[model samples]
Target: SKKLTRSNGTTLEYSQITDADNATKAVETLKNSIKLEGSLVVGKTTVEIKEGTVTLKREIEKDGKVKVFLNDTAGSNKKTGKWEDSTSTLTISADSKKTKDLVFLTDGTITVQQYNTAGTSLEGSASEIKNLSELKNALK
Candidate 1:
């Protein structure tokens, strides 16, 4: 079970229903609660969390943004993914309040193009994402 208190005085308490032996299953259930409805065909990479900031060095084309997924574990699926719009750089800040644990996920896209003698790399495209509420409403 985990409790979250947002800066706006809103409180959220989330729990899992399962026996200890089924811990993995329980985690998957909880993840579905905050999973991104959209699907991604490309691969994803993990970014290190540094003082509430997660930095990534990948090639992202112009007007392209990467979707960031957050979780308690840096490389776990049981986390919430938030989309951060990026141009040249991507920076995300959590609420001033303390969050128990956090993680992040992003497609293998970098802001800068890599140039090597072998060949010139093509730029990746940006993506747009909808929030949980917006997704729910669209489902109706």
Candidate 2:
């Protein structure tokens, strides 16, 4: 069993259950209490993702915004990106000259891409995220 708490007051109780009814209850409980800004936990390991901030022209923007996601796990039904060998961590970072920086992550692998202000893919990029420190470095 694992307890996940969001930045807010929300809290989630997660436990792997094979039984269908109990699994449904577990998911319902999680759906009702979670957020995008928090640490990532996989089994006995935990990774912290700081409150993301946005900036412009290398200057920190006071009112800038950011987006985040956390979902999936190794060898599931999701068709999205996944780790090459058993899943360890998931994070994505994209930098562009014209658009606001975007980050994406799931149970899959870390996929990076460049985009434009219009929200269109500009170019393809990828990174190996061994840890959060590396993630911060890629965002730089």
Candidate 3:
């Protein structure tokens, strides 16, 4: 159980939020939390967070292509630290009409490939993600 206070100082009680033994609501909430950097379109969506020495990113392109990444150079080691990140993107375009189902491995590395409705890697879309960010110097 949990308790929360609103901006108006109203007290609220919290209890378990259940949804017929499904994670639908939780997943929806998570998806809603991510900020979109560009205009709404049918092409792609990407997220990149670079604060101080920490970095995190994710980008979902057409045809079941997607990537997730994270890194903190100093969090592991300073001089010898190598930031964890995705490889290159758009190197392969998915042939399907939707994003591919993501699978996580035991290691922290992530891999994405385009798959058909029947679930087949279109071409060799399977590849590590690679991309980044920075505002203009005038804005800086």
Ranked by lDDT, the better of candidates 1 and 2 is 2
**Winner by lDDT between candidate 3 and candidate 2:** 3
Candidate 1 steric clashes? 7
Query: How accurate locally is residue 103 in candidate 1, as Cα lDDT from 0 to 100?
Result: 23
Highest-scoring model, TM-score: 2
What are the per-residue Cα lDDT tens digits for candidate 3 across 1-140?
33444353332232343432211111101221222231112334444445555444444444755555444455333211112225332222123233332332223223445546554445455543221222111011
> What are the RMSD figures for all models against the true structure?
16.8, 15.8, 17.1
lDDT of each: 0.28, 0.32, 0.33
Report the CA-based lDDT of candidate 1 relative to the real structure. Answer: 0.28
Clashing pairs in 2: 81-108, 82-108, 82-109
lDDT of 2 by residue, 9-127 (tens): 33444455344223211211112222222222222222223323421111111233222332323243221222222232222323222322223333222434444555454555644
- Which number leads on lDDT? 3
lDDT of 1 by residue, 19-129 (tens): 422221111111223332121112221222221222312221224433443333344222233344542222322332221211222331222222233333323443232
TM-scores, all candidates, are 0.18, 0.28, 0.25
Q: Looking at candidate 3, what is the lDDT of residue 138? A: 8
TM-score of 3: 0.25
Which pairs of residues collide in model 1? 58-110, 59-110, 60-110, 60-111, 64-126, 69-81, 71-103
- Backbone clashes in each candidate structure, one number apiece? 7, 3, 6
